[PDB]
Amino acid sequence: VPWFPRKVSELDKCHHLVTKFDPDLDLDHPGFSDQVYRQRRKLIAEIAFQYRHGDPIPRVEYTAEEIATWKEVYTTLKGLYATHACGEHLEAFALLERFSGYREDNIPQLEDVSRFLKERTGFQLRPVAGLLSARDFLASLAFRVFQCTQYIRHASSPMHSPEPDCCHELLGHVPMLADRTFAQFSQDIGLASLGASDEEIEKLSTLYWFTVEFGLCKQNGEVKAYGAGLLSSYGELLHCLSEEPEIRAFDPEAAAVQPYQDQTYQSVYFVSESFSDAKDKLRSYASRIQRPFSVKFDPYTLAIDVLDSPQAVRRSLEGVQDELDTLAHALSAIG
Amino acid sequence: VPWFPRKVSELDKCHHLVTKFDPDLDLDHPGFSDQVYRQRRKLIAEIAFQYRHGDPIPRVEYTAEEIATWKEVYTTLKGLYATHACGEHLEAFALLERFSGYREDNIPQLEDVSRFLKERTGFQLRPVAGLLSARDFLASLAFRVFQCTQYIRHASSPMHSPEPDCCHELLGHVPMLADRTFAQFSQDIGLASLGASDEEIEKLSTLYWFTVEFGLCKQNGEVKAYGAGLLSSYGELLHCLSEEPEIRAFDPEAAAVQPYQDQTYQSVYFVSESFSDAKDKLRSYASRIQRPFSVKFDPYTLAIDVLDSPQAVRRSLEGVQDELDTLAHALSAIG
Amino acid sequence: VPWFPRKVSELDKCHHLVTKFDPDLDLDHPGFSDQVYRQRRKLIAEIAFQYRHGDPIPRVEYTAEEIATWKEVYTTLKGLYATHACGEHLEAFALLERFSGYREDNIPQLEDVSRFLKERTGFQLRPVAGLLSARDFLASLAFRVFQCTQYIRHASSPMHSPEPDCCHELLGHVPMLADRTFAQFSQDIGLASLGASDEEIEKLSTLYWFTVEFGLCKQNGEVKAYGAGLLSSYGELLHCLSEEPEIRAFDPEAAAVQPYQDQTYQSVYFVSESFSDAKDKLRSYASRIQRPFSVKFDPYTLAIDVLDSPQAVRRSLEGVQDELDTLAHALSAIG
Amino acid sequence: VPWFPRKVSELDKCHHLVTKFDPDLDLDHPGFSDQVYRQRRKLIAEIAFQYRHGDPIPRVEYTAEEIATWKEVYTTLKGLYATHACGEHLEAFALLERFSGYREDNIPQLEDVSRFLKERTGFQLRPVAGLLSARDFLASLAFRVFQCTQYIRHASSPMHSPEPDCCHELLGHVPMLADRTFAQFSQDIGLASLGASDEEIEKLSTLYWFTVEFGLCKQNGEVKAYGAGLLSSYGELLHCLSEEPEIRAFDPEAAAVQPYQDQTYQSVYFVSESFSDAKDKLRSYASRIQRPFSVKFDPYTLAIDVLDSPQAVRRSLEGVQDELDTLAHALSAIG
Amino acid sequence: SLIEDARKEREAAVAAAA
Amino acid sequence: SLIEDARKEREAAVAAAA
Amino acid sequence: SLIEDARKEREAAVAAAA
Amino acid sequence: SLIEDARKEREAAVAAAA
Ligand SMILES: NCCc1ccc(O)c(O)c1
Ligand SMILES: NCCc1ccc(O)c(O)c1
Ligand SMILES: NCCc1ccc(O)c(O)c1
Ligand SMILES: NCCc1ccc(O)c(O)c1
Ligand SMILES: [Fe+3]
Ligand SMILES: [Fe+3]
Ligand SMILES: [Fe+3]
Ligand SMILES: [Fe+3]
């Protein structure tokens, strides 16, 4: 049976011990030839690898090249976010810009943003770099923690980045992660991903790429795109809503088997009328996914407990019924 | 209507802004004449006042006098904890000593211990010093955060401390806070304390002194004391179980009105057969306590939401029913 | 505010006191000229009006004309039920024929059938005749009791009946009422109908005609019709599945406003993928329907309690949480 | 494994088929020598044995001897019910006398009373006579149906009856059965009794004799007796509250093993502060009682379903969560 | 048939209003 | 009376055992 | 110690009242 | 990118099998 962590404690320990000295090459990618970019990657790797769970996120200074790119991307993308964006995304940056400091002239840090997300939506960011496997990334998603990188895309191609960077995750992902319903929907995916077999890991991971990175929804009577990739690429932002690419109703099985492409735009899209429809369907899909047990999350301790015996189920149930009694007394007091 | 904080954000901000430059005198107390003790108090105050929510707890070095006192108290108290102690207390330090490093020769720090408690029981410690009011202390208890001080008792009276210090809270309180059922019981008190009137604050606070600092229970067929004060004073440790002091069944109203004494041992004791009996009784007592609304805690964001309208109740209810459906699917998958 | 009954006690009393001597004319309808038919109507009315709640259903003997019609309709309809029927409908009569005695040569009674439905699905039939208003019929539906008539259609038109009779309800309705999910779905409609305003009564009633009497569903990969009218008329049975009539996805608002016709086939159809989709949508529709209170049903006493104050909500909640604790203990015992 | 019925259908069938021609002798008992009493017993047996589930209770006429005894007992007991009675008992007969017709000069029937109890508390009475075994009696209690006899005690000893009769059950039991909380408490006993082993049947049955027939409670600041036997015997009515008999706190194990006596007053009494305390304690006791499965009751169909697999648990859970959603929507609509 | 019931209920309700 | 019922059930159950 | 806290809270609250 | 991850996980898992 595949091994999976049980809580954040082993996640940092085992993952930071077995893995070591794994620098990224990315030579064939556009740019990545200047020695400065290699130094930044080394700086990010040392900050990431040596980081321990629960410690504050180290601050990283930014030179002119990255700040200038942030200003250009922020100004261009911000002027287009009025269209093709989703309701939660709009107020997402609106509050963030007023509080997190999102501006073209001012690129925010990680510690300040991480505090804001955890305080509001209970989300924390792990500044990881290099290659990320599937199980570890999904496991982090289960704990409601999103892996992130400190460096940004190469200045050679400001419009698009061959590999995900800070700006891509910050723009495409951060506004969506702020959504409470979406946050819970993402968390369920992580829990389901835990303990998934080799094929199952691919199956569940396939939905993320076709749902999180690229996604469509119909709210307020108009269709909008919520996928991080759709809102991250200016060219893809117009293309996603364009009728040229294929658009189909969201389907778990279809997305997990639908063929994909790399280094190219996307023509196959899945659209969900409401996020809740995706939520329960995945949970039903997860139930359909064979597993010798289940999984539960405890926010009181940020721990994960296996669900394989009735006694464990009763343990959680007892706490559940306690809340109802507390709420019932509150209802009696009120009115 | 009395003002109360809604989340940790304002708790640190408003409390650290209105309050300022409030050193402790404690001159008439035994000792407190050496300039060194005053310097330590100033060091603790500066570390405490300048601390911000979410930051790591600064490490404080210990000289010989405090470490020697820790060794003596640890050795003497540890040899007596085999009796008069409660079941949860025993394994409390047993795991802590193996992991937290509790030993007479080695006095642990705050950052390491704080991490352990939050990871297991989701508890965090705020290194506060000086005088603590009632509402703020209860409000912190509501958020499951326990206020603590860095300095220890005066070396003049190692057996007992005129004022609570690190050793008192660490020994009397920390083992009890580690209890899951007790942790939830303490949390309910904090929630009830929130918004309590002047008299109500006293009433709810009265139970804490007669229940948390001093408490008795009957488990495994023998009576044991769980109050922090009972397990903190060697003389009171024998006195509490002694038949000389008055012992009575736990009663919310009786404790909240029962007369008290200071700078002297305790003769009136309240004993609860089980912690759950205390839990529901207080919740019923809280329901009896008039309040224009209710209060709820969200572990996903560590936030507190007022309970005054059905819409807010439905908001929590929707999440509650979602958990049952998730658990129901897990049950279907299992077996 | 419109008056509504609170339990079965007043339902029988007030309805059987205010209403009296209300014979049906039905002269312009096909047949209804023979004195025998008028005598049967009088016999049904006297049995119906004088009946009291909780009493056994009086047995009514059948002559050759009705039994012969039952044999013809049963034989013809039974040979076609293999197609256009729904899964629950199939086993519905299969068990009924084996137990209730459904056969062309043997027409069952009401007392035996009523016992079977209540025992399995907790449904009881009230042998009512004459004109039935909207509020009373919906109120009966709320209590899970279905009004029924003893006499059957006129022998002049065995294929179709200008007015509903025993055979229509027995074939079109009885198999569907046996469905547990459908039974609960129908019950929710009755509860929502209670207290509905004049326009609201029409709105909720409109869904019944477009959903219960005529309905479509997609199960097992094929589309089948569950409406009583669709399965009651041989000509309409083929027409309903035919592509000539308009077919549209089920919509509460659309059905409640969609124009209707009488004494003619139906061309507008609403299809629901699953019964649960209809269930929650109506409940959401009911929530959308303004009402100064809510309504709840108590199977332990077959009573209906208004839902206008939190205290009433808590009353039901306390019983709800008791069941979870009982189930939780059962789970602990098992395994 | 012991056989147990699953619903009322087999309860009547198998019990009325295996058992047959089982008249009662009761010759050594006081009286029972007049031929008239034997004829009444035969009349009761024929009415009881031939009765079928769901049929109306046949009316039985009363001569002068029984009506005169009813008047004497009613007048004497009614004048003493002002003391030693419990709160629910008081209003129990008060409503019954106003509605059920409870009076010394007028002895009510069974059909009218049975309708009243089922309508309010959902209780039905089975007019059974002769010897009643343990499993069948407990099984009936599980379905919330109370076995009863039509004949009354012998006129030779109006003060006390050597064997239970209609007056004993009507006075001692009927007022208590009307209590909603007590009704549910009694129902839980029946469910637990189902499937109990030979020793377990005795153990659970022992609590009934020491709790239902004889019971004490402390409400409104005074101690009152709720046991049917205590409120049925005038001499025992004063004796039960008297200090001469032993009085002890209610204990499941103690009652199930505590020695008993027959044809004599009772000196050992169990007192429960509140009915709920008895309720949960028995449920915990039932959980302690080994059983390869659990049991659940469905009021919608008055059926009993075994609880041995998670799938069955989920089936009930799905309905449970549906109620919360319906209630949640009702809460949203209100206010 | 529901059409007739809807109007019948509406006219009956409004009959007393006037 | 329950005493007699308890023994009656026990003896009846054990009667077939022997 | 709670005794002093109770009076301290009460006197502080009532101090502004007068 | 998930395509490469899926194959990478599959080949890594099956590499030890052979
Ligand atoms: N495509 C590289 C892997 C990856 C996975 C998820 C992301 O959100 C992301 O930006 C990048
Ligand atoms: N007595 C000073 C106030 C105080 C309150 C609670 C404690 O646990 C404690 O150690 C001290
Ligand atoms: N159309 C007459 C009224 C009516 C309403 C509902 C029915 O199911 C039915 O058979 C008849
Ligand atoms: N003692 C005979 C058996 C019996 C059991 C329960 C009763 O309530 C009752 O009146 C009689
Ligand atoms: Fe991405
Ligand atoms: Fe303390
Ligand atoms: Fe019909
Ligand atoms: Fe009795």
Numbering used by the authors:
A (entry chain A), B (entry chain B), C (entry chain F), D (entry chain D): 163 to 497
E (entry chain H), F (entry chain E), G (entry chain G), H (entry chain C): 40 to 57
From the paper:
To further confirm the presence of an α-helix in the 39–58 region of the N-terminal regulatory domain, we performed the 3D reconstruction of a mutant with the first 35 residues deleted (THNΔ35). The mutant was purified, incubated with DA (THΔN35(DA)) and vitrified for apo-TH and TH(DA). It is however important to note that in the TH(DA) structure no residues were resolved upstream of Q39 in either TH(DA) or THNΔ35(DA). The important role of a full-length α-helix in locking the active site for regulatory feedback inhibition of TH activity was revealed as a large increase in IC50 for both truncated mutants THΝΔ43 (18.1 ± 1.0 µM) and THΔΝ70 (19.4 ± 5.6 µM) while THNΔ35 shows a slightly lower IC50 (0.22 ± 0.02 µM) than TH.
Mammalian AAAHs mainly present as homotetramers with a three-domain subunit structure: an N-terminal regulatory domain (RD) that consists of a structured ACT (aspartate kinase-chorismate mutase-TyrA) domain preceded by a less structured N-terminal tail of varying length; a central catalytic domain (CD) that contains the active site iron and binding-sites for substrate and cofactor; and a C-terminal oligomerization domain (OD) responsible for dimerization and/or tetramerization. Inhibition by catecholamines and reactivation by S40 phosphorylation are key regulatory mechanisms of TH activity and conformational stability.
